[PDB]
Amino acid sequence: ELLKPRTLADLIRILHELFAGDEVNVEEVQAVLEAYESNPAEWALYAKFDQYRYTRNLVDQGNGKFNLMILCWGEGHGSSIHDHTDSHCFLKLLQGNLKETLFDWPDKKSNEMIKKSERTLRENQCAYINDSIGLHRVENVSHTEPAVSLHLYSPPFDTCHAFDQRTGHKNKVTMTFHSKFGIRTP
Numbered sequence: 001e002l003l004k005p006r007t008l009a010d011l012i013r014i015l016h017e018l019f020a021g022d023e024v025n026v027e028e029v030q031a032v033l034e035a036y037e038s039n040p041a042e043w044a045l046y047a048k049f050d051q052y053r054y055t056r057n058l059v060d061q062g063n064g065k066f067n068l069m070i071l072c073w074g075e076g077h078g079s080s081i082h083d084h085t086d087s088h089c090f091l092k093l094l095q096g097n098l099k100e101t102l103f104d105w106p107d108k109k110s111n112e113m114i115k116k117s118e119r120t121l122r123e124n125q126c127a128y129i130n131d132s133i134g135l136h137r138v139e140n141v142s143h144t145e146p147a148v149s150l151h152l153y154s155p156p157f158d159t160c161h162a163f164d165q166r167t168g169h170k171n172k173v174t175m176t177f178h179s180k181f182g183i184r185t186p
């Protein structure tokens with residue numbers, strides 16, 4: 001039975017229930033994430049920005065089944081074209097807007113990676129990606145408004161690949177956390 005999360009804390013409790021087993025009902029997880037109405041007071045602790053690039057701030061470790069984190073995107077900050085290491089990845093906007101550009105997995109032959117589609121993700125909306133859907137880039141294209149998003153990955157992963165848009169060549173990258181549970185983790 002899926003109920004509306006009343007607060008971020010309630011959302012976390014609900015997620016622990018939805019991930020108690022060995023599989024993931026993607027549509028139910030997406031629905032509960034969408035239903036949580038972003039309340040900035042509840043997540044201010046995690047919203048730690050860096051001047052030069054987007055930051056990843058761990059909120060909950062999901063008793064091992066998932067990581068829930070808040071990403072903070074300065075004006076003009078974006079990601080690489082990347083995969084998600086055989087994990088489910090949910091993205092919900094808490095503040096601002098992000099542009100998501102989708103790409104196909106490259107062929108082994110070196111070639112320009114052409115965009116398959118793009119969309120604008122708006123406040124409170126929840127998107128989903130996995131490697132079977134494709135690769136993506138996420139960017140805050142705003143010149144005036146920082147963006148904040150809530151991300152859930154299951155299983156957790158701390159490495160992925162970044163893809164060179166001009167060739168499709170990939171490189172392994174290790175992901176780091178700017179903070180964990182509200183504490184800066186240099």
Ligand SMILES: N[C@@H](CSOO)C(=O)O
Binds near residue numbers: 071079091
């Ligand atoms: N996967 C990127 C953010 S775009 O993914 O919903 C990251 O976790 O840093």
Ligand SMILES: [Fe+3]
Binds near residue numbers: 083
């Ligand atoms: Fe991503």
